[PDB]
Amino acid sequence: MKSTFKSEYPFEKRKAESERIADRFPNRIPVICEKAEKSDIPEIDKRKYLVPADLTVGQFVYVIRKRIMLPPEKAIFIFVNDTLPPTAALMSAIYQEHKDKDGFLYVTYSGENTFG
């Protein structure tokens, strides 16, 4: 599968969990990454990333690397909308134009530097 939040749970519920994260930390950016099948990296436990609006993709690329705790010899890359944003890009500017109708964000990481 790819996502069970929309399948397993309703679309509102999701937007709900955010409604609170917004009332609690409206200065954050709950990015919802999704394992990239294409890649061959080891799956994660869950997909959740609460970063500030002052952090850049760079950091994120690292955060994820934590969830997968990849080796220092490997190199993972983040992708959005079947794209590959820079590390300088701000998670606020990106999510700003990458934001979904549900609010959350949809990104995917892959051990390879390819969009698929």
DSSP the chain: ---STTTTS-HHHHHHHHHHHHHH-TTEEEEEE---SSS-SPP-S---EEEETT-BHHHHHHHHHHHTT--TT---EEEESSS---SSSBHHHHHHHH--SSSSEEEEEESSS---
Name the method of structure determination: NMR
- Starting at the earlier edge strand, list the strands of the sheet with 105-110: 49-52, 28-33, 105-110, 77-80
81: left (phi over 0), alpha (psi -120 to 50) or beta: left
Domains of the chain: 1-116 (3.10.20.90)
Yes or no: say if 31 and 23 are a contact pair by the CB < 8 Å rule. Answer: no
Q: How far are the Cα atoms of 14, 22, 34 from residue 69, in angstroms, in the given order?
A: 27, 29, 16
Give the β-pairing of 49-52 and 105-110.
unpaired
